[PDB]
């Protein structure tokens, strides 16, 4: 494979002025200071940038880059995007299931994975966890090899690497680059961007491209840059790294000075002559969804801390609540305690559903990388991640809370009431989680999303029906009560609980009211709060939640679909 | 100044095995891999480590290190501990006020500062802000020079630097080290720890100390390490950095192998012979408190975002509350709304007082560095930081909330009630803030402290007196209500508000109760909640808060006094 770029000029303001070159099978490095187009040219060559600002032409074996390019070309990110909770084998299996063709057999996929593991030298760690915060894992030198394998699964002909050594140690980096050279000798074109290498690394390059401030200061074989700069009016003393020597020149031991010098250099003429010589989904929806769900559930189980903790907190809180409110009485204090406990349950569901902000925020970069690479669609990823994480870990706390507190407190002893309470808690949890996803989808920082969620839930709680009577609010403001999830949940719980209750011992208020200001039945309390006594007055609330869910889960999707992938 | 260390062996497990050497006026560098005692020997020489594990002897001009050592010796940290909100002049003024003697005149201090600024070359930025998130500031290359000036204020004879170039760019680092050499030529002993330098840096060193895995692989002039390793059985090729060459040897291109080789080397014999040749508060409390307070208040004003935001939120929330609860009525719904609004106010104060976790956590490292260096005592720092940040920014929100909502709602129209409400809000805010400080003092991560605060406040809210009646709780649990700040605040507010109110129109319940289950007066509501009607029953709550404050503000102090400074 030969990748030739001619008269590239990318503008966002401009970052690359005018760049020409070719890259043949072997080791091709792109060096320079951080400001220069060291990392931008790599994205441009890799089709990971918006073609809108691109000007020049990129060609492969004489043909332009097809739309099938990013699928046949591997790109390794600087930082890790491997699932630290899986194993070195599981990550490769997931990559192979979505990057390879379905025509193949699982045996063929396993053979490909075995060959890749053997080539990389991961045989002894093939079944060990890559590692996370809670989980002890492999060293940072083999995570990189796992990431490289995830791209070699498809056996591409061109391999792009963004700073493969940054973060690693010297002895690790040397081994990594020796491995890369061994790969390149097989007939692969490796193109990478390094940051201030050492000479033990510089001695391995087969081609060098030096960029500074968007200008090409040199392009050619890496072994002749020393001679070029020696003959250009500079001298390097002994025991000085040539890679450090180049950046020392660039800093000043002017940009247009070096640019013009190279444009008048012989290498520029050779590159221009060579460039003028030539020019002159994969899988089904169900498969993607199944595999995404499997990976997400493996990650959920393999991180027992942050999921078991929620269950433990739920159980403890439920027991405390059942102890404090034990034995609700049908007396003057029954109304207060019933309303208070239901209010606390509802608001606690809403506030505990703030952790959903972490769902699509922690794994944003991985999602973008895998979508660009053609793993799956947005729909399948979204549905699978909902089906694996949100659904089971939001359905369970409600069941636990209800099963624990319902009989300790001594609420309405009917089966239908029990299950209605359970279902209402479930719905309020789902609605709050969906709202959190909608607010936090596409972002990358948890803090602002969490703060906004907290503020919105605080105002919702104000408009729930305990702190303020909803029939006393002014007309020009009351409508806001229809934007409150807690209101619907609390209303449904009250309707289910208070209907056939008496709260004035010795007095038959159900028949008649002796005194007008007594509040001796649940119906009176409900009507005084503005609640409808018909069965619709219950189920209404539920539908109002369901619609919310739908709406929010739609917005989130549209915030992922229209999200900038470049 | 000549610093000689003999037979140093520090144990925590051991980190340094056996180290000998001397450091004379000039540039003395300590190189090696990260695992080695590169940074530990620097702390040991600088007396910034616990002498408990130390074994050998450290000497200065033949005399051991006095207790007055760290005050006469400068230590520059790797990362910045300069106040990004002040100016380059203000930081030096603060350093000079506490590190210099009070006998001097402000004119003399200003002259010293001017001389330091001139020597460093900060004349053109002497009155520009160093820079924070919100504030644009100076480049990273001059923050380091400001930090160096903060230590040169006292004009020490020995200057320690921990990785002065890590984080900086090449051109910045070269200038920094040239500045250090220019300083050293005046007659100062500079001792620093570098991480993999470049040859343009290595050519400046006057003495080198190579450590790996707690072993001394070489000590002597930096210009002869090349010859030593050449004659020791190794060869360096051209265009290879000697500093990279040494670490390449250490990694393996064994630890005891090199250790023994050096122990049998000539340099070890010379060092041992030389070592056997020789051996064989500043200011008043009020001044410290005043200056700490001034700096903290300057930082508070110079960060208007996170302080103005709280005021804006307070005003907005107060207006919303006054609009929702506008015109409280003396009818069936007056009790509910009054209780709800008071409950919301109290819990909002408690939950908004969570930001105090940031007080002593953000500036932990600066506090430790300045305490070790002899700036001030713990008492003065603690009191000043309380007096500058907590007091004014917790006193104001209560005043705003009260002044806004009291008359929109239409609460008890008396002056004493107004001021009692204000004072109660203030006290609850202070108590919650003190609890947060006690929980978060000495830590370094905000997340766990915030979570613990939230949980504690949730349980406190449960035991406040609205969600559950406190007279219905079982005896083996009711006592917990005495650990609730919101309970005391809410009780005081209720007592102040409900006393002389009627809530049943057309009915004179104050005289007699026609029906037993009516709740037509505030006294009945209060007694039904378990509240005492005597004036003590009000002020009691306040004292219960005051004690809390004291206790918490004591615990925090003891968590700073017994905090590990090393």
């Amino acid at each position, epitope marked *: 494979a030969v990748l030739s770029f001619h008269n590239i000029c990318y503008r966002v303001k401009e970052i690359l002025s005018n760049i020409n070159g070719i890259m043949k099978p072997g080791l091709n490095a792109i060096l320079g200071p951080t400001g220069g187009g060291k990392s931008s040219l790599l994205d441009v060559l890799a089709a990971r940038k918006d073609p809108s600002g691109l000007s020049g032409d990129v060609l492969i074996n004489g043909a332009p880059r097809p739309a099938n390019f990013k699928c046949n070309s591997g790109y390794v990110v600087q930082d890790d995007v491997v699932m630290g909770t899986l194993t070195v084998r599981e990550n490769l299996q997931f990559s192979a299931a979505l990057r390879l063709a379905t025509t193949m057999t699982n045996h063929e996929k396993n053979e490909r994975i075995n060959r890749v593991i053997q080539e990389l030298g991961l045989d002894k760690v093939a079944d060990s966890k890559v590692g996370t915060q809670f989980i002890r894992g492999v060293s940072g030198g083999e995570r990189k090899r796992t990431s490289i394998g995830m791209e070699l699964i498809t056996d591409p002909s061109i391999l792009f690497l963004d700073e493969p050594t940054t973060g690693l140690d010297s002895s690790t980096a040397n081994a990594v680059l020796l491995l890369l050279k061994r790969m390149s000798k097989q007939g692969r074109t490796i193109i990478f961007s390094i940051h201030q290498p050492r000479y033990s690394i510089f001695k391995l390059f087969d081609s060098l491209t030096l960029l500074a401030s968007g200008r090409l200061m040199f392009h050619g074989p890496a072994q002749e840059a020393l001679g070029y700069f020696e003959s250009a009016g500079y001298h390097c003393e002994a025991y000085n790294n040539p890679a450090d020597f180049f950046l020392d020149i660039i800093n000043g031991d002017l940009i247009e000075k070096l640019a013009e010098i190279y444009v008048n250099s012989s290498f520029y003429k050779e590159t221009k002559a060579e460039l003028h010589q030539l020019s002159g989904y994969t899988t089904s929806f169900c498969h993607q969804l199944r595999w995404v769900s499997k990976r997400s559930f493996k990650n959920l189980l393999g991180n027992p801390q942050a999921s078991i903790a929620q269950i433990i907190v739920t159980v403890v809180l439920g027991l405390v609540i059942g102890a404090i409110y034990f034995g609700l009485k049908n007396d003057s204090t029954g109304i207060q305690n019933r309303a208070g406990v239901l209010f606390f349950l509802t608001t606690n569901q809403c506030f505990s559903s703030v952790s959903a902000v972490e769902l699509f925020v922690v794994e944003k970069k991985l999602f973008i990388h895998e979508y660009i690479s053609g793993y799956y669609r947005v729909s399948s990823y979204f549905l699978g991640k909902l089906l694996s994480d949100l659904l089971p870990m939001r359905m369970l706390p409600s069941i636990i809370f209800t099963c624990i507190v319902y009989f300790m407190l001594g609420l309405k002893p009917k089966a239908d009431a029990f299950f209605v309470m359970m279902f209402t808690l479930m719905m309020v949890a789902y609605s709050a989680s969906s709202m959190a996803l909608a607010i936090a989808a596409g972002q990358s920082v948890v803090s602002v999303a969490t703060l906004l969620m907290t503020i919105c839930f605080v105002f919702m709680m104000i408009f729930s029906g305990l702190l303020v009577n909803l029939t006393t609010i002014a007309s020009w403001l009351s409508w806001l009560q229809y934007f409150s999830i807690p209101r619907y949940g609390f209303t449904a719980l009250q309707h289910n609980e208070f209907l056939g209750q008496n709260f004035c*011992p010795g007095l038959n208020a159900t028949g008649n009211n002796p005194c007008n200001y007594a509040t001796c039945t649940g119906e009176e309390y409900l009507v005084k709060q503005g609640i409808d006594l018909s069965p619709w007055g219950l189920w209404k609330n539920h539908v109002a939640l369901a619609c919310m869910i739908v709406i929010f889960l739609t917005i989130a999707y549209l915030k992922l679909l229209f999200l900038k992938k470049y | 100044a000549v610093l000689s260390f003999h037979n140093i062996c520090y144990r925590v497990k051991e980190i340094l095995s056996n180290i000998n050497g001397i450091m004379k006026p000039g540039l003395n560098a300590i190189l090696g891999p990260t695992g080695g005692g590169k940074s530990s020997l620097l702390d040991v020489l600088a007396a910034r480590k616990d002498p408990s594990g130390l074994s050998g002897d450290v000497l200065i001009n033949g005399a051991p290190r006095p207790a007055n050592f760290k005050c006469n010796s400068g230590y520059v940290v790797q990362d910045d501990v300069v106040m990004g909100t002040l100016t380059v002049r203000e930081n030096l003024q603060f350093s000079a006020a506490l590190r210099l003697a009070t006998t001097m005149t402000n004119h003399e201090k200003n002259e010293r500062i001017n001389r330091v600024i001139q020597e460093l070359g900060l004349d053109k930025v002497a009155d520009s802000k160093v820079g924070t998130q919100f504030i644009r500031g100076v480049s990273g290359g001059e923050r380091k020079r400001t930090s160096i000036g903060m230590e040169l204020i006292t004009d020490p004879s020995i200057l320690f630097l921990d990785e002065p170039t890590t984080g900086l760019d090449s051109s910045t680092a070269n200038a920094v080290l040239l500045l250090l050499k220019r300083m050293s030529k005046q007659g100062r002993t500079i001792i620093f720890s570098i991480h993999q330098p470049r040859y343009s840096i290595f050519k400046l060193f006057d003495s080198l100390t190579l450590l790996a895995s707690g072993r001394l692989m070489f000590h002597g002039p930096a210009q002869e390490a090349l010859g030593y390793f050449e004659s020791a059985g190794y060869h360096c090729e051209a265009y290879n950095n000697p500093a990279d060459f040494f670490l390449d040897i250490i990694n393996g291109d064994l630890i005891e192998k090199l250790a023994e080789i050096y122990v049998n080397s000539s340099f070890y014999k010379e060092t041992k012979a030389e070592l056997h040749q020789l051996s064989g508060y500043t200011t008043s409390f009020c001044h410290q408190l005043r200056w700490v307070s001034k700096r903290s208040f300057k930082n508070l004003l110079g960060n208007p975002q996170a302080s103005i935001a709280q005021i804006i939120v307070t005003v907005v929330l107060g207006l919303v509350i006054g609009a929702i609860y506008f015109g409280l009525k003396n009818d069936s719904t007056g009790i509910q709304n009054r209780a709800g609004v008071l409950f919301f106010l109290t819990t909002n104060q408690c939950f908004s007082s969570v930001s105090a976790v940031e007080l002593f956590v953000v500036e932990k490292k600066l506090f430790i560095h300045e305490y070790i260096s002899g700036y001030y005592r713990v008492s003065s720092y603690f009191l000043g930081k309380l007096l500058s940040d907590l007091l004014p920014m917790r006193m104001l929100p209560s005043i705003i909330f009260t002044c806004i909502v009291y008359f929109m709602l239409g609460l008890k129209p008396k002056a004493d009630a107004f001021f009692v409400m204000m004072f109660t809000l203030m006290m609850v805010a202070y108590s919650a803030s003190s609890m947060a400080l006690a929980i978060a003092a000495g830590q370094s991560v905000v997340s766990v402290a915030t979570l613990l605060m939230t949980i504690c406040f949730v349980f406190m809210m449960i035991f406040s007196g609205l969600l559950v009646n406190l007279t219905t709780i079982a005896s083996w649990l009711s006592w917990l209500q005495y650990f609730s700040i919101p309970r005391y605040g809410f009780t005081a507010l209720q007592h102040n508000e409900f006393l002389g109110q009627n809530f049943c129109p057309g009915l004179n319940a104050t005289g007699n*109760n026609p029906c*037993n289950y009516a709740t037509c007066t505030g006294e009945e509501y209060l007694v039904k909640q378990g509240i005492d009607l005597s004036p003590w029953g009000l002020w009691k709550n306040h004292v219960a808060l005051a004690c809390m404050i004291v206790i918490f503000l004591t615990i925090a102090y003891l968590k700073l006094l017994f905090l590990k400074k090393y």
Partner: antibody
Amino acid sequence: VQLQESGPGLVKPSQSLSLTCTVTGFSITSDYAWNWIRQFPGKKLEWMGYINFDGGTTYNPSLRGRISITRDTSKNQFFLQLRSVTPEDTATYYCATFYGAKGTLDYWGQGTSVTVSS
Amino acid sequence: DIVLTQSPSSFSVSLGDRVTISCKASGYILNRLAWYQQKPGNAPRLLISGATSLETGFPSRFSGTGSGKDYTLSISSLQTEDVGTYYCQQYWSTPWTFGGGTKLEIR
């Protein structure tokens, strides 16, 4: 509105005590609450508990698990069962009525004496 | 709970005289105070409710006055049909409690 007690006037220790109150002039499932009170020798009144018109019941905490109050609407009666009796709870027992809107014990029975001996 | 205390466990008066009985509570009662009269050989009979109201069937010689924790029953110009035992009851909290009782005598 017209209450009448009945039951054994003598009981063995730690066995049981059962009294019955019959109501005439009113239906016990309609409006009021129905209480049991006892008066010790050396006159001292003690409220034991009640059963409400809807079947709910409430008991004095000083009688922990020893007392149960039941009813039979078929013939308008309510019963008091005090178990694990001791010679200290020898007293005169009354059944009484509680309106609730007024708060006071308006109607009382004639009272029956109970002696716990052996 | 709430314990009601009657200080004069016994009294001694003569016809036409005025007598006063006091009940003191350990907690606020809010006029949920009742007074019962008991003769020897009969069940208690309600005499006063609400601490001020008088029950139909009794003369306008008994009066009730109180507030907070202190309440009093005044019998002015007592007769011979007024001798007996008098009990104060509170019906504020569910464990209703009676007083110890005050017995009237005749000199």
